[PDB]
Paper text:
Within this cluster, we showed that a GH31_u1 protein from Lactococcus lactis (LlGH31_u1) and its fungal homolog demonstrated hydrolytic activities against nigerose [α-D-Glcp-(1→3)-D-Glc]. The kcat/Km values of LlGH31_u1 against kojibiose and maltose were 13% and 2.1% of that against nigerose, indicating that LlGH31_u1 has a higher specificity to the α-1,3 linkage of nigerose than other characterized GH31 enzymes, including eukaryotic enzymes. Furthermore, the three-dimensional structures of LlGH31_u1 determined using X-ray crystallography and cryogenic electron microscopy revealed that LlGH31_u1 forms a hexamer and has a C-terminal domain comprising four α-helices, suggesting that it contributes to hexamerization. Finally, crystal structures in complex with nigerooligosaccharides and kojibiose along with mutational analysis revealed the active site residues involved in substrate recognition in this enzyme. This study reports the first structure of a bacterial GH31 α-1,3-glucosidase and provides new insight into the substrate specificity of GH31 enzymes and the physiological functions of bacterial and fungal GH31_u1 members.
We determined the cryo-EM structure of LlGH31_u1 at 2.73 Å resolution using single-particle analysis. The cryo-EM structure revealed the hexameric state of LlGH31_u1, and the overall cryo-EM structure was similar to the crystal structure (5 A and B). The Cα root-mean-square deviation between the cryo-EM and crystal structures is 1.340 Å. In both the cryo-EM and crystal structures, most amino acid residues at the hexamer interface were identical. The cryo-EM maps for the side chains of the amino acid residues in the C-terminal α-helix domain were well resolved, and most of their conformations were almost identical to those in the crystal structure. At the C-terminal α-helix domain, Val716 and Phe732 hydrophobically interact, and Gln728 forms a hydrogen bond with Lys720. By contrast, the local resolutions of insert 1 and insert 2 on A-domain and a loop containing Tyr99 on N-domain (discussed below) are lower than those of the other regions, and the cryo-EM map of these side chains is unclear. Furthermore, slight structural differences between the crystal and cryo-EM structures were observed. Although the insertion regions are determined with low B factors in the crystal structure (the average B-factor values of insert 1 and insert 2 were 30.2 Å2 and 33.5 Å2, respectively, and those of the other structural components was 33.7 Å2), the structural difference may suggest insert 1 and insert 2 flexibility without the crystal packing effect. However, the cryo-EM structure suggested the flexibility of this residue, and this tyrosine residue is not strictly conserved among LlGH31_u1 homologs, including CmGH31_u1.
Residue numbers in the entry:
A (entry chain D): 437 to 739
B (entry chain A): 133 to 588
C (entry chain B): 12 to 739
Amino acid sequence: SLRWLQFGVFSPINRLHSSKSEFTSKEPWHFDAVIEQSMIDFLQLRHQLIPYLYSANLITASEGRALVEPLYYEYPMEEEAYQHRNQYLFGEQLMVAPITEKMNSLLQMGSVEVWFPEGTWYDFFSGQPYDGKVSLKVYREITEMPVFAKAGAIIPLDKNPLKKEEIPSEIIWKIFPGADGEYLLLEEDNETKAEFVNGIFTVTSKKESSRKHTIIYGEHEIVSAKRGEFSIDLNGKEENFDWNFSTALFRRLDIAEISYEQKDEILQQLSLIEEHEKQVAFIKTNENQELQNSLFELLYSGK
Amino acid sequence: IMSKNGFAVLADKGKVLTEVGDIAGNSVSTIDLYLFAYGRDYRQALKDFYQLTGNTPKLPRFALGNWWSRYYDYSDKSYLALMDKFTDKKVPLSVSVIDMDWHKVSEVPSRFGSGWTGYSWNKKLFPNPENFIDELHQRKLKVTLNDHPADGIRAFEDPYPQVAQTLDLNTELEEAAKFDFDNLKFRKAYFEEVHGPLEKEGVDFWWIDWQQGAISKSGVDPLWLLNHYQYQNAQKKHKNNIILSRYAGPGSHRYPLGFSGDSVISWASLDFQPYFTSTASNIGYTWWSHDIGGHMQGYKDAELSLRWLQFGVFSPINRLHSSKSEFTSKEPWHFDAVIEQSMIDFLQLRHQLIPYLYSANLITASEGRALVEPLYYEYPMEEEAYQHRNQYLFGEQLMVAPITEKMNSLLQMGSVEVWFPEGTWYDFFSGQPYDGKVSLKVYREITEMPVFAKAG
Amino acid sequence: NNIIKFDKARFTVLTEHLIRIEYSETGEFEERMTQMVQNREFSEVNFDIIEKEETIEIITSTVHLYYNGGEFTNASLFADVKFNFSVYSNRWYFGEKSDGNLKGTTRTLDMIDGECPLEDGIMSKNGFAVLADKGKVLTEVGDIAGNSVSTIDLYLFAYGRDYRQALKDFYQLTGNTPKLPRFALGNWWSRYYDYSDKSYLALMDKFTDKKVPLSVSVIDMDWHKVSEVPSRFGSGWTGYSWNKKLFPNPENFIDELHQRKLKVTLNDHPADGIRAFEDPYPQVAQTLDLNTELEEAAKFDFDNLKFRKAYFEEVHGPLEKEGVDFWWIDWQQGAISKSGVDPLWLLNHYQYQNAQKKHKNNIILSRYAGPGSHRYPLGFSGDSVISWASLDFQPYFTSTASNIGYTWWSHDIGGHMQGYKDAELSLRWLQFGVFSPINRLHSSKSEFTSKEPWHFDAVIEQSMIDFLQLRHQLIPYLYSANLITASEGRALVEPLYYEYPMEEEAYQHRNQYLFGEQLMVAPITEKMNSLLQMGSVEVWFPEGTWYDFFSGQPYDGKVSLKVYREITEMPVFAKAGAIIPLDKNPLKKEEIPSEIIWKIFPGADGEYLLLEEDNETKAEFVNGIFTVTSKKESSRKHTIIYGEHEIVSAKRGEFSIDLNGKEENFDWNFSTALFRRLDIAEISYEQKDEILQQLSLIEEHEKQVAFIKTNENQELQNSLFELLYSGK
């Protein structure tokens, strides 16, 4: 149910359905605490994503651009774009590869094979970086989902999903550092242009409005509840996210159902060895292969 | 001293003791034996054993709460922060155990060897030990420290000069690590100038960690002498004080408490532990203190931790223990929400059960009735009372059958085989009724435990 | 000086890490030599004594001894050891078994298929060990003098993790190993078969035709009369009479064997004794005792002086006059001691003492007889089964043998008895044997157990021939290592922790060892993977650059790696800067080679010292300059190999040369190796083309590793990862 709903949040229409049975309730409080909290968070995220979905709707009605697109619409001349069926593009800024297989009980994490085209990609939620053209097996807990944005992406989000407003009163702009960025938020009777050129972020409006703007650069808040169309310089700020190799490695080793001595040995050796090639060589000797793949993903992110 | 056949033989292999409590050498008798022929009256046999070898002394009330112990390099402010976090999460605690890192370890001079032995406060981590102990007592916690007497009193110790004036001054340039617990003067110096200032600082009782292979010097096991004299000395600090030490054969039940440790973190250890604890009553050792969480080695399983703690709450002593590893924390907030809430609920239940445990303690000290008893103590003439090892009686009102096997993923419920004697029994938590003599497989979720009380 | 009396015990400080402890109840202490100990004249060190009324205390720079008087017990006598590394328990108790010992050898070979229970040695990870002198008193001439006066005698070794110094001091205490002759370092041939003289000569000529060099010919017990013994006498295993039906002219046969430049040995079975039907029996009858009326004189009692003289002068005498070089003593008995002394020890001692007149620095074949047997080489094992488990166990046994001073083991190459047939097992076993102390091919009485190279198919036969030639190519290196071992006491085959004692990985690889002082060997002891057509082995590489001795594949610093080789290849590695001397003409039989090839691995400075019988050649490689100098005048020619390219061929005299402008790289490249590895794999063709194309197209190393991580077959993953790591 949790995985299905995670897929549904990043689908065209999110419609929870239950039948005539007391065993088929889809209410979040029908499950345990962890599942319920994850469901509530994703249901809130769906309403956070409404302005993006409406802008994609207007684009589809005007020019005829599908909200959900296969990989080979943007990369038609590459073979890997035809070998990943469940990977797609959600709008024009995000790439989604949902996890549709049961979790590995040893690792307590599900997995999915993801193809990354040329460029730098970041996880939409944690900020984990990914390099250019490569096929990689990525692992996520049941409360996490693989969604990626390339460097330079600009995402608008509603700041108050719980409040029911015909138009949001404040919008958060999420910027992924690394390149120039472009976005055009279309509304019923307005058009907001967001530019990110040479480290300068500019927001302009076609009509007068009382909307406030909050800026997120990586993970750090830049300006909160700024009023009116404006410009700002982000060259001196911190481009990096909050993701680092050590904390992620400790978290992955902490939830694995393996022997303690193995966990301490892996942590100590991966902290001690400096060269990346020798780190990969060290993890290549491990007898458990899914743990090998998870550690390889962590090492590739932190190269 | 218990047998299904009806008789057993206890061999008095020990050494002669004086009227004050001192060793008097080998016995004149070549061999001495005690034949117990009580049949299947095990309670009377235990009472007469306690009459022969001495009743178990009373335990203090604070010993019946939750103990916290972690082998970590704690600082005073960090320790206080951890205790405040425990208070914030609604987790009651009774005893704070500070491991060997309370003293100097890595700053011992190169000449001296293993810095495991120590009697000097680490001022870098504990700038004001008196204030730290005062804060701990302000939070109403009893404090104990780990002690490693194996090496001895070296010259770098802060209290070393005083002992030097008592036992023997160094001839030209030497030291006085003469750990020979047979001499009266050495014992006096160790109990007055070594432990004395620390107990004045506010230390309540002492954790004696003697991990040695019985290096007897006068034909007597040093651990027995340590236990005897340390328990005799602990009585001046508090009324009915206790120690932490190890088992030393029959007659050790007079000096509580004795811990086991050294268990691996696995489902097999959890399967074995209830049987070991209940069977310990057959020799008069009724105050075992197991390592709650496991000790070393093993694999990770949150369900294993939850089940282990559920067993520990209904055990003689509840002492959560963690080792020097960031992956072996036993804190409730180290797990997910469901496991954490279940752990918090059971830790609260342990302190809810304290008056019952103290009444059982007083009964045990007075008449000699074990808190944890095997099924065949109350139903000696029935075969099923000998076919359920992990089922026991907790006090005189409750029957406990802990679940020590992994949950069935299809049902999301663990199971255990329980024998119900004649009468009506109710689940202590849900009130589910059970009829008379019957063997039944019962199923509980990981957040539930099988505990039963009979009607009335 | 270094003698301390206390109570009924005596303590001697032989050195700062070795302490002798003696306890005698009567009151007299042993002073003469024993079976094990041959010398106690060490230097003088600094130590302190603390004396009480009833206790004594001994202070040494690394050990601290406590004795409480009376009998020795863990409560009375014990000690502490102070070392830089730490340990859970650093206190030694008398009589209490201690853990951490690195084990030694075994008196009897007793493994069923694989591992056998070993005995303790003088090396420990904790840092101390105790050697008990349980032997019997020896006189100043070499005769048993009965039981020792001392009740118990012990030697405490407290060298910590300095194993080389401990071995050197053990050799000082018990005597250095004598030198071995050059011919013992070649290939030995042995088959238990009913050979005729003409058939044996034909077999030797066949070996010569197939280009296989040999050094020693071993003739088993069928050389004497077996089935012609009269009914009265029992087992015909004992024999000293030539079988004239098979050997009409033994003198001419030995002359032909020496004409082919082979050393000849014969099997001897002294257990029964000298019976009356022997050809030399009358002579012995005149020496020991004439038969009273009608009897015989099979009085095999090796304690009597007169019997030993007669057996060494009249039994072995004529045979050694015919031309027999050394003797193979096959005493398969369960220690039937008559005077409390093991007869095998006396046989070894007196036979080795006797063999020195025939040749300078002669040897024998016999069995191990406890500590102190290293003075009488050689000792063979045999009795191993022909299985993969025995091959798995053998390198560890051979390398661990150095912990007790026994460094000249001679295993049965091919297995001995029972077992199953596998040509790959034979090839792997021989590959291990070529890089072992002694290479001795052995076959039993069965037409199915022949070890001849032509008994197999073409590939196996060619590989065996190549490795047999390489063994004779390696002879100068082995002889130099022999001279070093006899001089300073350095084992030819050493465990990894002799050179890297501070590193944990040096204790986690049992079958990896150091062969001499320049090469590191990790033999493959498991069956090939049929999918990859390659066997594999886990190898630990210490800090620095290493190259494969045969292909030149490079390997980086400290790393654990699974390496893959075909059945015709072996993992042998040399670090950068190594210098290896090789014989240029292994097929030619020369007492000293006329030309030597020097193989140099580029990357660092290098140094080698080739020791010969009457010469010393020094090879320096400093700052790209290679210099060869000689102690004495010689006509030897020198050839230089830098990487794989020849530098100078048949250069004469001591010289110097500059190699800065040459090509440091070898012939190994990633593309050809990858193509070869993919060409022999039994996988789909499309997979091979995809792997080759993608690995040729992707430039970054990280993305190449990421590409190979997605492959579903994991052994192919490991092979490709080894190739990618080499070519980084």
